[PDB]
């Protein structure tokens, strides 16, 4: 890649470009976006994100020691398709 | 979970709501937002989001039949802890 890591902050300063919105405003959207979709995965929501992928919470079951759960993401088939070489 | 699935929609109301900005100007954010992680990931970018996770392009060998390429997420502490019971 040219641009080897795009950090939370990169993709503020990329919105707000496009966007044409403060960098003050989609900073604050952005962590905020990122809370709630913590928020709702604490709560075992799946978060659905139509045409990107989608979050939810897993399980390993106590015979895989005791049962755990994880965060985990589905990419959704457009975003599959867009990083195919 | 109260709510089962959180859909992109919801969540542009959550963050409408938690930051005060209009709705509006969320929903163009949420999408400009989707559509850089993609065009970074495309290209072959890690997407570094401090306090959440990291997307990054992962590879399968051609021996695993030919090679392919997929996008993947690596939650961060930060949220593995918060989804534990």
């Not at 897993?58 to 965060?71: G, L, M």
């Amino acid at each position: 890649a040219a641009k080897k890591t795009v950090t939370k902050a990169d993709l503020v300063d990329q919105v707000a470009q496009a966007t044409g919105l403060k960098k003050k405003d989609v900073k604050a959207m952005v962590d905020a976006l990122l809370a709630k979709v913590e928020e709702a995965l604490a709560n075992g929501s799946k978060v659905q994100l139509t045409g990107f992928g989608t979050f939810e919470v897993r399980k390993r079951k106590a015979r895989t020691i005791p049962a755990t759960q994880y965060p985990a993401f589905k990419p959704g088939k457009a975003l599959k398709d867009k990083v195919k070489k």
